[PDB]
Amino acid sequence: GIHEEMLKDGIRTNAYKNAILQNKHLFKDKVVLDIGCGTGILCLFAAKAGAKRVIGIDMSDIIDKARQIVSDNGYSHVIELIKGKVEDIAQLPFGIEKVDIIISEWMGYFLLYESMLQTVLSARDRWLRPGGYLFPDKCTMYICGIEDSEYKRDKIDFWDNVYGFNFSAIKADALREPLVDFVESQQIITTQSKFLEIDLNTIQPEDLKQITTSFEFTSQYQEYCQAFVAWFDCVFSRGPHKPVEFSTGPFTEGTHWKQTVFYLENDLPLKPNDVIKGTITISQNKSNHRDLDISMKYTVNGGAVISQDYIMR
Amino acid sequence: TGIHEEMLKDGIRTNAYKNAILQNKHLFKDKVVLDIGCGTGILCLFAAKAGAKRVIGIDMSDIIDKARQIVSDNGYSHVIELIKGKVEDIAQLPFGIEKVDIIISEWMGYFLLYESMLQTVLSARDRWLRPGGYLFPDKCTMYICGIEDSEYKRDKIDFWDNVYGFNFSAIKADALREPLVDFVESQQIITTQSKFLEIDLNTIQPEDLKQITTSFEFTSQYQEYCQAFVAWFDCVFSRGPHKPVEFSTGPFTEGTHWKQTVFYLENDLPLKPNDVIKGTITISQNKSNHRDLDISMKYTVNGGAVISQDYIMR
């Protein structure tokens, strides 16, 4: 079910498609490895671009349907597929020990949740020759404040009266869950703050154990603000002769990632030119490591510190 | 927890249960009530508010903890007792209770039967339900008809012929075997509706569910191509209410969270008005995953040659 959503993600798939096939001279005779190949669509892109040898890794049984897809499209001699977790691979096949390029569809929701980032960097440190390329290599995260009163009454305030009963005991866990959904451009009531940047060319895995950063944006209206919305941008920076990018924000057409919406326990009554400045800290949950802890502490006009904690479960 | 928000925001479903219970307070008053898969306890609260003397909720997930608080918060701790565990693992009901007067359960799965709690409801009925007790709800019937759905068949099935210039037809086979759980507009229905299954939880034996064999018949009303069949189930709170309560999950009423189940035809049927599509459906537990649903169809158009298709709901 995943790969239909992936392949129907036009904005996503076309970005990878353009960055690969629009630099055929770059790819020709290179050895390419594709972390999480799935149906093999990107392996097919690299092979079509001219790669001499392509390796796909994938842990599910989708590896089987991919072999057939690749055999059907006449690249079985070029594209070699391995079933398994990257972390279980003794050696790449055929005694290959270095690769020229690493391809991965690794970005999760909120970029980092259930992402393969920690896997890509492991394949990068094990196999990527000095100066190799990563498609993609650079991500920046943004955030801003929105007016979203209709949805906050519906997903948050709803538990105060459920068929006449008082279900407020759930209200806390509703606020703790960030919402993955689409936000309309009209709802934004502030400027946008860039609060994180990952460069897979240089970022070291240790620098991900706990991420500490901050954000700043200014309100433009006298308005109550009920949530913050984050999203990430992607660049195939190094490799193409002109850069390729796609966004997951609300100013362009949607991707399957949507946006991430973070509900404020108390609405901030903002006035124009109010300065919202704050700290975000992001780390893997202590108990279930596939969960994402995200803590926020912020102020409005250097005022008292509002703090909220979120778990992406 | 994502399940229970979805369940509770399903208005058509929750109000049917709300109506079947609170509209018979004289029936429920002083009864002992059992709730299979109580969740947040909303139905227990319906039962307690209805006048029940004792309500018991069973649930295997940890949501039972939040339900304890919700019950205490709405002032029913003395009525409603909650137990954590699988119903099939409960040694005895609490307090030395050995029989109950009413069983409430939200058990219906997708396509009514896929990953349904039906066989759990039935052990709880055979273990604890007094002779002549009530099951909320007790009778479900399934319907089927044929639709015009060419735009979505081109998009969900024909998509695999060329994805970004490559040939992905190897995916096509498994795409057709997977029934689509989704909403279909009534406007697309091009045939009469065939009722092809009926379950009465008062009398059905669990064994009679391992393999269900039945049939269906519906008539085309238009000159039109038909690309899929759509099935759905209705629910009735038959015995207990003095005027019956029901809700549907079909495309002529408001949507519920179950939506509809769509069965794509490998070959489109060019139908004419008054064509008769008649067939056998058989539904059985998959051999490899027992929680997977095998669904087999063999049918004709005007008694012509037998078209047959097989599906797995995984």
Ligand SMILES: Nc1ncnc2c1ncn2[C@@H]1O[C@H](CSCC[C@H](N)C(=O)O)[C@@H](O)[C@H]1O
């Ligand atoms: N640690 C790991 N080792 C090997 N494969 C992994 C993995 N973690 C995730 N995967 C695989 O990565 C895939 C990500 S989906 C992306 C598929 C493909 N690159 C495309 O764009 O269409 C999943 O199919 C999953 O099976």
Ligand SMILES: Nc1ncnc2c1ncn2[C@@H]1O[C@H](CSCC[C@H](N)C(=O)O)[C@@H](O)[C@H]1O
């Ligand atoms: N074998 C089993 N034993 C106990 N609880 C079960 C069970 N199988 C499913 N359940 C529970 O049944 C619930 C069904 S969801 C329905 C919740 C509630 N009755 C409502 O309508 O709002 C789930 O919470 C699940 O935890």
